[PDB]
Amino acid sequence: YVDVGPDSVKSACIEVDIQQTFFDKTWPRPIDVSKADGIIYPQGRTYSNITITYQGLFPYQGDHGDMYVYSAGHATGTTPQKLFVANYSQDVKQFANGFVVRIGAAANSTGTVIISPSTSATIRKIYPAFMLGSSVGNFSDGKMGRFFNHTLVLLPDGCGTLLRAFYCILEPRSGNHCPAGNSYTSFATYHTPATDCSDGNYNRNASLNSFKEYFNLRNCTFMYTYNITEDEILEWFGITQTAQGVHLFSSRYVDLYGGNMFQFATLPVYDTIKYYSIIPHSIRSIQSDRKAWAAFYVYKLQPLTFLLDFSVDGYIRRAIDCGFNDLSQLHCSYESFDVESGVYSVSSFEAKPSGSVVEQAEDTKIASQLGNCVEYSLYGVSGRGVFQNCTAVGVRQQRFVYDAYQNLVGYYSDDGNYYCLRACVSVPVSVIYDKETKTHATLFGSVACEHISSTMSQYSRSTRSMLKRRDSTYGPLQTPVGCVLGLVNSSLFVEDCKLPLGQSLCALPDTPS
Amino acid sequence: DTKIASQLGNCVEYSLYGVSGRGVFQNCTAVGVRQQRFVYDAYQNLVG
Numbered sequence: 001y002v003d004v005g006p007d008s009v010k011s012a013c014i015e016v017d018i019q020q021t022f023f024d025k026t027w028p029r030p031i032d033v034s035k036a037d038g039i040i041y042p043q044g045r046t047y048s049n050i051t052i053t054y055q056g057l058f059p060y061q062g063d064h065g066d067m068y069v070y071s072a073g074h075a076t077g078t079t080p081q082k083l084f085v086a087n088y089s090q091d092v093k094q095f096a097n098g099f100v101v102r103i104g105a106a107a108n109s110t111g112t113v114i115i116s117p118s119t120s121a122t123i124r125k126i127y128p129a130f131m132l133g134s135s136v137g138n139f140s141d142g143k144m145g146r147f148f149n150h151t152l153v154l155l156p157d158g159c160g161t162l163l164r165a166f167y168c169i170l171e172p173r174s175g176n177h178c179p180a181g182n183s184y185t186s187f188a189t190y191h192t193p194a195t196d197c198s199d200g201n202y203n204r205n206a207s208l209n210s211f212k213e214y215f216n217l218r219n220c221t222f223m224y225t226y227n228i229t230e231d232e233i234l235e236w237f238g239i240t241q242t243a244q245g246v247h248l249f250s251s252r253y254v255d256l257y258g259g260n261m262f263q264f265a266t267l268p269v270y271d272t273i274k275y276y277s278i279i280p281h282s283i284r285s286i287q288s289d290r291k292a293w294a295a296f297y298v299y300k301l302q303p304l305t306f307l308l309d310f311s312v313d314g315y316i317r318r319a320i321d322c323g324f325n326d327l328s329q330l331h332c333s334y335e336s337f338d339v340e341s342g343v344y345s346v347s348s349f350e351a352k353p354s355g356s357v358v359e360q361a362e363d364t365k366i367a368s369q370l371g372n373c374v375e376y377s378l379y380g381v382s383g384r385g386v387f388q389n390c391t392a393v394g395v396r397q398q399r400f401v402y403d404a405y406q407n408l409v410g411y412y413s414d415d416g417n418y419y420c421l422r423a424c425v426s427v428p429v430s431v432i433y434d435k436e437t438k439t440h441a442t443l444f445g446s447v448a449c450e451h452i453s454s455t456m457s458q459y460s461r462s463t464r465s466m467l468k469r470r471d472s473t474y475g476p477l478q479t480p481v482g483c484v485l486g487l488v489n490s491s492l493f494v495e496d497c498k499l500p501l502g503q504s505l506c507a508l509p510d511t512p513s
Numbered sequence: 514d515t516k517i518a519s520q521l522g523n524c525v526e527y528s529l530y531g532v533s534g535r536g537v538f539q540n541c542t543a544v545g546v547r548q549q550r551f552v553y554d555a556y557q558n559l560v561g
């Protein structure tokens with residue numbers, strides 16, 4: 001196995017007090033895909049200044065992410081005391097095709113101490129620590145997140161210039177405040193700047209040794225290290241897993257200023273990762289020496305399609321999440337960032353299922369429910385649709401009435417009533433796009449505004465919020481063609497809008513640029 | 514193995530780290546991104 005070095009020496013662990021309510025903050029950072037935030041550059045290829053579609057794992061454009069903040073522990077006077085940290089060790093998550101993170105984005109600005117926030121200390125970048133693996137379970141005290149068998153460990157040591165990776169078995173310890181003890185609270189790791197990080201001798205084993213004090217390393221099968229140099233600039237990092245093993249990505253090695261990720265390293269492990277957590281960490285520094293740290297963020301990858309704008313220097317500079325909006329769908333269909341003005345069809349709202357209705361004599365109370373769009377089963381016949389009470393058509397006791405295209409038309413219930421079936425209905429959608437002002441509006445077709453609402457329970461695509469930027473303040477407007485959003489009743493007469501809606505309707509642009 | 518590292522050239526068969534095809538090479542300017550090694554167009558033809 002790997003030569004891990006010496007075992008832990010002290011038996012007792014420094015106590016970990018959970019102060020998690022101090023860490024509740026709301027500093028969201030949604031992905032800006034027009035800036036190419038979070039984009040993993042494609043593997044093995046590069047391109048010219050041409051725009052191409054691409055498919056791969058990416059963050060959603062609308063995701064605000066998850067936020068975590070490292071902070072100094074308790075100290076008083078001129079000396080260190082006990083840790084006062086966040087409860088992040090209990091935040092077990094299901095792994096889901098990797099994740100990406102944002103690090104140091106609040107650099108060269110100020111924030112607060114958090115644990116004693118009134119001091120208002122300036123903030124600086126700090127690197128994250130992580131643990132990954134195939135299984136989790138209870139600590140002997142019932143605490144969440146104990147990993148089993150072998151797990152990944154990623155930790156910086158001391159100052160951010162050294163990074164280590166491990167695939168190893170963790171071992172519980174019988175010391176006071178440690179995992180086999182009944183005095184255990186929660187796992188944490190720490191750095192002590194009062195003796196660590198000398199400028200002529202940075203302590204390369206600093207965080208690993210504090211890690212060893214809570215878990216003895218055993219049976220380690222892999223270890224790696226990497227070299228980093230200090231730089232307060234914002235950075236991107238992330239993890240994916242394939243049948244070739246885990247991949248590590250960073251923007252630092254290749255594209256430090258543009259922020260595009262590149263495949264920095266790979267790992268030999270072939271075990272599937274099923275769970276993910278963040279290791280909490282804290283600074284042991286003296287009370288007058290405290291320093292606030294920049295916020296850390298996490299976003300989750302999904303197998304999304306995107307337009308990618310490539311620079312002549314091959315950097316991705318802009319991108320569009322195709323499924324984010326109906327307008328984004330339009331751009332992807334024309335493979336461009338500048339669609340010509342017009343009225344364009346976009347995908348329709350579907351239906352929205354309703355709770356099931358079942359009849360099969362031979363469970364309650366679903367015998368009938370008229371009715372909207374409730375899934376159904378009738379003596380092994382199934383489908384989704386709306387039922388209505390109707391007349392009586394021949395022939396009775398054949399039970400299922402059908403049309404010439406073999407669509408079910410209606411049904412004889414065992415309550416003696418004929419009901420008819422219309423399947424379900426949908427709302428067609430189109431958008432009005434004015435390229436000159438870069439503005440838009442929408443049309444719901446013949447649906448009528450009695451079925452239209454500010455939010456949707458159908459549905460089609462994840463948001464329509466760009467319309468809502470003006471339409472949070474207005475009711476839907478009925479027109480002879482149909483219900484529309486953000487149209488306004490100006491009652492103007494004009495010869496040609498270059499955006500006719502059909503009929504005598506006309507969609508004037510707001511006054512020209 | 515030698516001496517076939519470069520030959521400019523008209524339409525010589527080639528192999529580049531397991532990528533292969535036939536074509537002419539020319540000493541032109543550089544382009545982004547560096548260290549992705551293979552430059553391609555929108556139809557996935559190798560460009561450079």
Ligand SMILES: *[C@@H]1O[C@H](CO)[C@@H](O[C@@H]2O[C@H](CO)[C@@H](O)[C@H](O)[C@H]2NC(C)=O)[C@H](O)[C@H]1NC(C)=O
Pocket residue numbers: 048049050312
């Ligand atoms: C790279 O794309 C740019 C456009 O983004 C192209 O630049 C155009 O070049 C023509 C020259 O015939 C000009 O008339 C246009 O005004 C330019 N567009 C601009 C400046 O936006 C350029 O040809 C492309 N180069 C390659 C190698 O594909």
Ligand SMILES: *[C@@H]1O[C@H](CO)[C@@H](O[C@@H]2O[C@H](CO)[C@@H](O)[C@H](O)[C@H]2NC(C)=O)[C@H](O)[C@H]1NC(C)=O
Pocket residue numbers: 227
């Ligand atoms: C990574 O950075 C370290 C410096 O932190 C380099 O390792 C040291 O290089 C000096 C050169 O004189 C030696 O005196 C030290 O003994 C080295 N330390 C160790 C632990 O070997 C190292 O070269 C850099 N690169 C890599 C790939 O590790």
Ligand SMILES: *[C@@H]1O[C@H](CO)[C@@H](O[C@@H]2O[C@H](CO)[C@@H](O)[C@H](O)[C@H]2NC(C)=O)[C@H](O)[C@H]1NC(C)=O
Pocket residue numbers: 105107108231232233234257
């Ligand atoms: C905080 O300080 C960093 C220092 O790393 C500054 O980053 C500069 O970012 C610009 C962006 O174009 C680069 O051109 C400079 O080279 C960077 N300075 C360096 C590397 O010393 C930046 O002024 C501050 N803010 C952020 C967010 O990084």
Ligand SMILES: *[C@@H]1O[C@H](CO)[C@@H](O)[C@H](O)[C@H]1NC(C)=O
Pocket residue numbers: 020087088090091144
């Ligand atoms: C840790 O704190 C978070 C705060 O959002 C909470 O949701 C979570 O349940 C906590 N973990 C526990 C109580 O195990």
Ligand SMILES: *[C@@H]1O[C@H](CO)[C@@H](O)[C@H](O)[C@H]1NC(C)=O
Pocket residue numbers: 136137138142
């Ligand atoms: C931890 O123990 C509880 C019982 O207190 C159990 O319900 C839970 O499933 C256990 N955790 C895991 C990951 O199985």
Ligand SMILES: *[C@@H]1O[C@H](CO)[C@@H](O)[C@H](O)[C@H]1NC(C)=O
Pocket residue numbers: 135148149
């Ligand atoms: C470790 O992996 C084995 C492999 O099957 C699994 O059965 C077991 O639940 C895991 N955990 C422990 C504590 O052995």
Ligand SMILES: *[C@@H]1O[C@H](CO)[C@@H](O)[C@H](O)[C@H]1NC(C)=O
Pocket residue numbers: 001169219
């Ligand atoms: C691996 O870990 C087991 C614990 O289950 C330990 O007993 C064994 O000595 C280790 N073996 C080697 C060869 O690393």
Ligand SMILES: *[C@@H]1O[C@H](CO)[C@@H](O)[C@H](O)[C@H]1NC(C)=O
Pocket residue numbers: 389390391392417
């Ligand atoms: C519709 O069903 C009602 C009971 O809900 C019944 O009284 C009525 O006769 C039915 N209408 C017909 C058969 O036209």
Ligand SMILES: *[C@@H]1O[C@H](CO)[C@@H](O)[C@H](O)[C@H]1NC(C)=O
Pocket residue numbers: 477478479489491
């Ligand atoms: C719009 O303006 C005209 C002006 O006469 C008015 O008659 C009409 O009721 C208004 N509203 C709608 C929904 O068309």
Ligand SMILES: *[C@@H]1O[C@H](CO)[C@@H](O)[C@H](O)[C@H]1NC(C)=O
Pocket residue numbers: 540541542543
């Ligand atoms: C062409 O190649 C020569 C060497 O064969 C080199 O010196 C020169 O810089 C190249 N021309 C470029 C890169 O434009």
